[PDB]
């Protein structure tokens, strides 16, 4: 009926955690705000020409 | 020196660079002192005057 279950892969001993999450995004208890995604960068130092 | 070479004590050699000391040249993984070898070119003039 109600709850949704997520398994903790790297659990310490045996804990189970219950929490709330409202439909509105603001009712969380913890906010994860991403600003910019992975920005790739490439280059090569001329002293050795080895790609980085 | 030329006398020594004929006796076989000294013999001319031409070797490559080890592929573990060649990849890291002038930087890269924790290297300290390994400069590259470079080349170049110079160009100069020469004057001349006529007589009678």
Curated annotation (Swiss-Prot), chain A:
Modifications made to the protein after synthesis: A proteolytic cleavage by the prohead core protein protease gives rise to the mature major capsid protein during virus maturation.
Subunit structure: Homohexamer. Interacts with the portal protein. Interacts with the capsid vertex protein that forms pentamers. Interacts with hoc; one hoc molecule associates with each capsid hexamer. Interacts with soc; this interaction reinforces the capsid structure. A total of 960 subunits of the major capsid protein forms the 160 hexamers.
Main function: Major capsid protein that self-associates to form hexamers, building most of the capsid in association with pentons made of the capsid vertex protein and one dodecamer of the portal protein. The major capsid protein self-associates to form 160 hexamers, building most of the T=13 laevo capsid. Folding of major capsid protein requires the assistance of two chaperones, the host chaperone groL acting with the phage encoded gp23-specific chaperone, gp31. The capsid also contains two nonessential outer capsid proteins, Hoc and Soc, which decorate the capsid surface.
Family indicated by similarity: Belongs to the Tevenvirinae major capsid protein family.
Protein's gene: gp23
Organism for this UniProt entry: Enterobacteria phage T4 (Bacteriophage T4)
The protein's name in its UniProt record: Major capsid protein
UniProtKB/Swiss-Prot annotation, chain B:
PTM section of the record: A proteolytic cleavage by the prohead core protein protease gives rise to the mature major capsid protein during virus maturation.
Subunit relationships: Homohexamer. Interacts with the portal protein. Interacts with the capsid vertex protein that forms pentamers. Interacts with hoc; one hoc molecule associates with each capsid hexamer. Interacts with soc; this interaction reinforces the capsid structure. A total of 960 subunits of the major capsid protein forms the 160 hexamers.
Transmembrane annotation, as ranges: none
Protein name: Major capsid protein
Shown chain mapped onto the complete sequence: 212 to 263 of 521
The protein's role, per its UniProt record: Major capsid protein that self-associates to form hexamers, building most of the capsid in association with pentons made of the capsid vertex protein and one dodecamer of the portal protein. The major capsid protein self-associates to form 160 hexamers, building most of the T=13 laevo capsid. Folding of major capsid protein requires the assistance of two chaperones, the host chaperone groL acting with the phage encoded gp23-specific chaperone, gp31. The capsid also contains two nonessential outer capsid proteins, Hoc and Soc, which decorate the capsid surface.
UniProt record similarity statement: Belongs to the Tevenvirinae major capsid protein family.
Lineage: Viruses, Duplodnaviria, Heunggongvirae, Uroviricota, Caudoviricetes
